[PDB]
Amino acid sequence: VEFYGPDRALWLGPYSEGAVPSYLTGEFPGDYGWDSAGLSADPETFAANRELELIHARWAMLGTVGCLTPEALEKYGGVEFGEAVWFKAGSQIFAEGGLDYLGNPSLVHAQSILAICWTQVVLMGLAEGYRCSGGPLGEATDPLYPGEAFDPMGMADDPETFAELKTKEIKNGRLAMFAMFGFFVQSLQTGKGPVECWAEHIADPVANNGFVYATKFFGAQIF
Amino acid sequence: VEFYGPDRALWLGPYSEGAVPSYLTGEFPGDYGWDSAGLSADPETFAANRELELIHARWAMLGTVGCLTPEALEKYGGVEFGEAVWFKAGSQIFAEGGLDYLGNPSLVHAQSILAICWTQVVLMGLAEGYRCSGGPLGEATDPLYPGEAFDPMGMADDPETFAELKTKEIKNGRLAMFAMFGFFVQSLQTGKGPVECWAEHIADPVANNGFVYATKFFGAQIF
Amino acid sequence: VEFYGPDRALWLGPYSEGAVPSYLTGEFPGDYGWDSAGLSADPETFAANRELELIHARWAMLGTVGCLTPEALEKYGGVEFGEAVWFKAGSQIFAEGGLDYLGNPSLVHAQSILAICWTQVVLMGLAEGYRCSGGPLGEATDPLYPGEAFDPMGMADDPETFAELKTKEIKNGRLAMFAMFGFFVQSLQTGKGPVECWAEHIADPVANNGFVYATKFFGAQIF
Numbered sequence: 001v002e003f004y005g006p007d008r009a010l011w012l013g014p015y016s017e018g019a020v021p022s023y024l025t026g027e028f029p030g031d032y033g034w035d036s037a038g039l040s041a042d043p044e045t046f047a048a049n050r051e052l053e054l055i056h057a058r059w060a061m062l063g064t065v066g067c068l069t070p071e072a073l074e075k076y077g078g079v080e081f082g083e084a085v086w087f088k089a090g091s092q093i094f095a096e097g098g099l100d101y102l103g104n105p106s107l108v109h110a111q112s113i114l115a116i117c118w119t120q121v122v123l124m125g126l127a128e129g130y131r132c133s134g135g136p137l138g139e140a141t142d143p144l145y146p147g148e149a150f151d152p153m154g155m156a157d158d159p160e161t162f163a164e165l166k167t168k169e170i171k172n173g174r175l176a177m178f179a180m181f182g183f184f185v186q187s188l189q190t191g192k193g194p195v196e197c198w199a200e201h202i203a204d205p206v207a208n209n210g211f212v213y214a215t216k217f218f219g220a221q222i223f
Numbered sequence: 224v225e226f227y228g229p230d231r232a233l234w235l236g237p238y239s240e241g242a243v244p245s246y247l248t249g250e251f252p253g254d255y256g257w258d259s260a261g262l263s264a265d266p267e268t269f270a271a272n273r274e275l276e277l278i279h280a281r282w283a284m285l286g287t288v289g290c291l292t293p294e295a296l297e298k299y300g301g302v303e304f305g306e307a308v309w310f311k312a313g314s315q316i317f318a319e320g321g322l323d324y325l326g327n328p329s330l331v332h333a334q335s336i337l338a339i340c341w342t343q344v345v346l347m348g349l350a351e352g353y354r355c356s357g358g359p360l361g362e363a364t365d366p367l368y369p370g371e372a373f374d375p376m377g378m379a380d381d382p383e384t385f386a387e388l389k390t391k392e393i394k395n396g397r398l399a400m401f402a403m404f405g406f407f408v409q410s411l412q413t414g415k416g417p418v419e420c421w422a423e424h425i426a427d428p429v430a431n432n433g434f435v436y437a438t439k440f441f442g443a444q445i446f
Numbered sequence: 447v448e449f450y451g452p453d454r455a456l457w458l459g460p461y462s463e464g465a466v467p468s469y470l471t472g473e474f475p476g477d478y479g480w481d482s483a484g485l486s487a488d489p490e491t492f493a494a495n496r497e498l499e500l501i502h503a504r505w506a507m508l509g510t511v512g513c514l515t516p517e518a519l520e521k522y523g524g525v526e527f528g529e530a531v532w533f534k535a536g537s538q539i540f541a542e543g544g545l546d547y548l549g550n551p552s553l554v555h556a557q558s559i560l561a562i563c564w565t566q567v568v569l570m571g572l573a574e575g576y577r578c579s580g581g582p583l584g585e586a587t588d589p590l591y592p593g594e595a596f597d598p599m600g601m602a603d604d605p606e607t608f609a610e611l612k613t614k615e616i617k618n619g620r621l622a623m624f625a626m627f628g629f630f631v632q633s634l635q636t637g638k639g640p641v642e643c644w645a646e647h648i649a650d651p652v653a654n655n656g657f658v659y660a661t662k663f664f665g666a667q668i669f
């Protein structure tokens with residue numbers, strides 16, 4: 001009634017009349033009528049874009065927590081990681097002693113980047129092949145909402161709550177994608193992790209805003 | 224007869240027979256039949272691309288004058304700006320004494336970048352909402368040519384002259400967009416403003432061409 | 447039977463059922479059913495994309511040989527080029543003595559970058575105009591397979607062998623495009639030519655892999 005149908009919520013709010021393409025009829029989750037570039041005029045291209053958006057969104061929602069958790073644990077929990085900041089976490093594998101999980105030498109204790117890379121290649125290749133075509137966990141009936149084995153708690157057994165939860169999922173996913181783009185740009189510009197940036201903004205908001213580093217083009221002092 | 228219809232002017236000149244997509248029938252302004260990438264084969268995507276092109280073009284036409292005027296005034300008019308070149312003009316707000324207009328400390332005299340940014344956010348948000356949906360100045364009857372309040376002098380009251388003026392507008396806009404891409408690349412490469420670059424090419428054209436800085440990839444001396 | 451039709455080869459192999467768009471019916475060469483982004487849903491956009499892919503592929507097939515040949519000749523043949531590595535070959539024109547072909551001062555012996563650039567502009571403009579619309583060498587009956595003057599040996603006179611050779615061409619071209627992207631990224635990251643990189647990987651594969659330079663973002667040590 002508010003996120004589906006003709007009377008739904010739109011991206012420009014009260015100024016959305018005429019900013020909504022005719023092919024965005026509020027049928028799919030997250031339909032705020034924002035296709036100003038006309039990249040989803042074709043229904044098949046629209047479906048491909050929806051799948052890409054939802055997959056990017058779920059990956060970004062995992063990534064926000066994965067980038068905040070080690071740095072937050074180091075700053076406020078006392079855990080001594082090798083590199084808590086997310087953009088330096090990969091370089092842990094080259095450090096002496098390897099990549100210890102939670103800073104504990106008896107956990108994971110990875111030492112070879114090649115083994116990690118190729119194990120991930122194999123596992124993720126199988127996983128994405130199953131995503132596209134089905135596998136051990138079931139058949140890919142829906143490209144985005146397979147359910148069954150991926151809804152063990154049965155939170156989507158009811159169609160209206162299913163639609164509401166799809167709206168919530170796509171909205172939190174778009175927020176997390178926005179936050180991950182923010183993480184990328186903040187790492188490029190400030191050179192410090194998101195937790196450090198947040199702790200600095202709340203300390204002196206006026207003097208520690210984003211325009212302090214505005215003279216750099218994504219970290220490059222060109223001028 | 225020359226910029227509309229089947230006998231119009233095409234992008235490859237005499238070698239255009241067979242390089243013109245069938246959906247570019249010379250109906251809309253600036254139709255030189257250049258869609259080699261097939262990005263406007265969908266009519267709705269074509270309309271979205273036309274709107275994007277015209278808005279980008281009008282912004283670039285404003286930008287050409289906006290980037291040339293302060294630097295030209297400083298170089299040949301004697302006006303003492305804080306930062307005349309366009310790519311350093313933003314940094315004036317961080318300088319001591321703020322951002323004075325025309326170098327006069329009694330004009331504008333901006334001192335806070337947050338105030339500028341958020342005032343612009345509010346004003347431009349309202350302005351673009353009006354562009355999409357209409358507002359105080361009228362109704363968005365046409366996404367690109369609203370007329371009425373935006374044609375006060377009535378220069379588009381004649382359909383033939385209206386089409387000719389639309390062709391002139393789109394051509395000057397494409398030229399301005401090309402020039403602004405040039406401004407961006409020249410700022411990245413040479414590191415000096417467009418007026419300085421122009422004054423240098425006209426001094427020693429052979430020795431001060433664009434290949435002097437060809438060893439830098441958009442300013443970065445990678446190799 | 448294996449690269450055309452319904453029983454052809456697919457991009458995800460055994461996990462391709464449901465990963466193939468309905469509009470990729472295995473009619474055109476190189477149809478592995480990989481359009482996950484839905485950029486070729488429109489048939490006209492599909493044709494434009496096929497033309498772009500084949501042209502990029504032929505250019506990359508030329509480019510791989512053109513980038514490997516001078517460096518390989520310098521390393522294993524003894525030819526003394528001014529700059530054997532492909533990403534520095536352009537800067538030979540600025541060196542003292544100009545650009546000598548094969549290092550011989552009696553071959554080409556180019557001295558002006560402007561003459562090279564503008565001669566190439568004229569010649570390539572005429573050549574691409576002919577490609578689009580036909581010219582001295584024939585008429586552009588097909589955008590990608592004109593034949594006639596461009597098949598002098600008559601290797602495409604049999605439709606079955608013609609289809610097989612089209613598949614071979616598109617596959618070798620896609621491999622060459624992949625390799626040219628590899629050349630770009632390796633030049634950005636390592637800073638040395640592809641032949642040097644290959645000679646280093648085969649010397650100490652474990653210690654001279656691609657993760658040694660993983661801390662740099664396309665050559666920039668941002669962190």
Ligand code: CHL
Nearest residue numbers: 009010011012013014015032034174340343344348349352
């Ligand atoms: C009534 C006014 C209203 C306005 C003006 C907007 C406007 C917007 N909404 Mg929106 N909304 C509004 C009401 C509402 N919205 C929403 C729900 C949503 C959603 C869910 C989303 C939006 C999004 C957007 C944005 C999409 C367009 C865009 O990206 O422009 C921005 C383009 C610009 C050019 C602005 C730049 C201005 C700024 C000063 C730039 C400064 C640049 C740097 C200083 C220098 C540049 C650096 C260079 C060198 C690289 C836009 C800001 C989307 C979004 O947030 O995407 C980002 C989005 O997902 N809205 C609701 C609830 C129903 C509203 C209720 O009233």
Ligand code: CHL
Nearest residue numbers: 232233234235236237238255257397563566567571572575
């Ligand atoms: C008869 C020959 C004729 C030819 C060959 C062209 C060709 C062109 N016209 Mg055109 N026109 C011609 C006659 C006419 N035109 C027009 C009206 C127009 C218009 C309005 C427009 C064109 C545009 C174009 C360009 C579009 C394609 C392109 O972008 O290629 C360029 C692609 C290349 C790969 C060329 C690069 C060659 C160069 C040597 C590159 C060197 C690279 C660097 C040195 C190194 C690379 C750096 C790396 C590291 C990043 C192209 C140059 C469009 C344009 O200007 O866009 C740019 C455009 O808007 N034409 C008219 C009037 C009716 C003609 C009349 O006869």
Ligand code: CHL
Nearest residue numbers: 117120121125126129455456457458459460461478480620
């Ligand atoms: C059975 C398993 C099987 C799997 C899983 C694949 C999977 C793939 N095939 Mg494929 N194939 C498979 C069987 C077969 N293929 C083919 C014939 C082909 C062809 C002709 C082609 C493919 C291509 C592809 C790739 C296209 C999707 C992609 O780009 O993902 C990759 C996306 C990722 C996100 C993977 C990244 C993982 C990696 C660990 C990333 C590491 C990141 C860095 C370390 C850090 C990031 C840097 C940052 C900072 C920028 C993909 C790897 C295409 C290709 O090669 O494109 C590249 C292609 O042209 N296949 C045949 C013959 C019929 C098969 C037979 O069984």
Ligand SMILES: CC(=C/C=C/C(C)=C/C=C/C=C(C)/C=C/C=C(\C)C=C=C1C(C)(C)C[C@H](O)C[C@@]1(C)O)/C=C/[C@@]12O[C@]1(C)C[C@@H](O)CC2(C)C
Nearest residue numbers: 505508512515547568569570571572573574576581582583
């Ligand atoms: C990528 C590439 C492109 C070459 C393009 C050429 C040659 C274009 C010619 C382009 C040629 C062009 C346009 C010719 C045009 C000729 C004309 C119009 C002839 C004619 C006439 C007229 C005048 C009487 C007029 C009448 O009305 C019609 C006609 C027909 O009678 C080359 C790559 C390499 O050369 C390097 C750089 C280095 C090497 O080591 C390796 C290789 C690979 C060889």
Ligand SMILES: CC1=C[C@H](O)CC(C)(C)[C@H]1/C=C/C(C)=C/C=C/C(C)=C/C=C/C=C(C)/C=C/C=C(\CO)C(=O)CC1=C(C)C[C@@H](O)CC1(C)C
Nearest residue numbers: 034035036037038056059060063066067086089177180181
């Ligand atoms: C709508 C619309 C309409 C118009 O008409 C046209 C239009 C404007 C174009 C269009 C709009 C479209 C828009 C806005 C596009 C925006 C896209 C964005 C921002 C996408 C963002 C994606 C971000 C992702 C996936 C992040 C993943 C992170 C990971 C991986 O999971 C890790 O963190 C993994 C990780 C972790 C967890 C710990 C670290 O230490 C190490 C690493 C590996 C980094």
Ligand SMILES: CC1=C[C@H](O)CC(C)(C)[C@H]1/C=C/C(C)=C/C=C/C(C)=C/C=C/C=C(C)/C=C/C=C(\CO)C(=O)CC1=C(C)C[C@@H](O)CC1(C)C
Nearest residue numbers: 013185189209210211213214215216217218219340344348
């Ligand atoms: C209306 C409404 C009603 C509902 O009831 C609820 C609701 C929906 C919530 C609500 C809606 C809310 C709406 C629409 C509000 C819109 C907000 C907007 C547009 C604000 C945007 C602000 C823009 C900013 C600060 C950009 C600053 C750039 C910096 C600083 O860091 C750079 O340095 C730039 C820079 C430079 C110079 C160098 C580059 O290399 C890197 C970068 C970072 C890009």
Ligand SMILES: CC1=C[C@H](O)CC(C)(C)[C@H]1/C=C/C(C)=C/C=C/C(C)=C/C=C/C=C(C)/C=C/C=C(\CO)C(=O)CC1=C(C)C[C@@H](O)CC1(C)C
Nearest residue numbers: 257258259260261279282283286289290309312400403404
């Ligand atoms: C046709 C076609 C067919 C094929 O099939 C596929 C295809 C090839 C893709 C396709 C072709 C498409 C092509 C060629 C694309 C080209 C796009 C280009 C160059 C767009 C350029 C746009 C540039 C703009 C808006 C400039 C704005 C500047 C401003 C803002 O107004 C200021 O200056 C503002 C300003 C001023 C005034 C003072 C300064 O101090 C500070 C700042 C803030 C910078």
Ligand SMILES: CC1=C[C@H](O)CC(C)(C)[C@H]1/C=C/C(C)=C/C=C/C(C)=C/C=C/C=C(C)/C=C/C=C(\CO)C(=O)CC1=C(C)C[C@@H](O)CC1(C)C
Nearest residue numbers: 236408412432433434436437438439440441442563567571
């Ligand atoms: C026919 C006709 C008839 C009508 O009656 C009237 C008409 C329509 C007018 C007329 C039509 C006219 C036509 C078609 C002409 C076409 C003109 C063309 C294609 C000219 C192109 C010239 C290309 C140039 C100079 C590029 C140089 C690159 C540099 C130098 O600066 C870099 O350093 C490269 C570089 C490097 C190496 C590092 C990167 O990081 C940055 C960059 C800058 C990219």
Ligand SMILES: CC1=C[C@H](O)CC(C)(C)[C@H]1/C=C/C(C)=C/C=C/C(C)=C/C=C/C=C(C)/C=C/C=C(\CO)C(=O)CC1=C(C)C[C@@H](O)CC1(C)C
Nearest residue numbers: 480481482483484502505506509512513532535623626627
């Ligand atoms: C399929 C698909 C489905 C999804 O749904 C969406 C999707 C994922 C997007 C989509 C996938 C598409 C993909 C993977 C895109 C990839 C594109 C790539 C890698 C294109 C690469 C092209 C590279 C080229 C032309 C190289 C030419 C080199 C030259 C010039 O000939 C020289 O070397 C010239 C040269 C030589 C020879 C000597 C040197 O000294 C000097 C220079 C001038 C450099």
Ligand SMILES: CC1=C[C@H](O)CC(C)(C)[C@H]1/C=C/C(C)=C/C=C/C(C)=C/C=C/C=C(C)/C=C/C=C(\CO)C(=O)CC1=C(C)C[C@@H](O)CC1(C)C
Nearest residue numbers: 117121125459631635655656657659660661662663664665
């Ligand atoms: C199944 C099958 C059956 C048929 O019968 C035959 C068949 C078809 C052949 C066969 C099919 C084969 C298949 C599917 C295999 C698939 C293989 C894959 C996915 C390989 C992936 C490996 C990924 C790698 C190494 C990435 C490493 C990144 C580096 C290292 O250099 C960076 O430093 C990353 C980096 C960083 C950190 C900074 C950036 O600035 C620059 C870069 C380089 C991006």
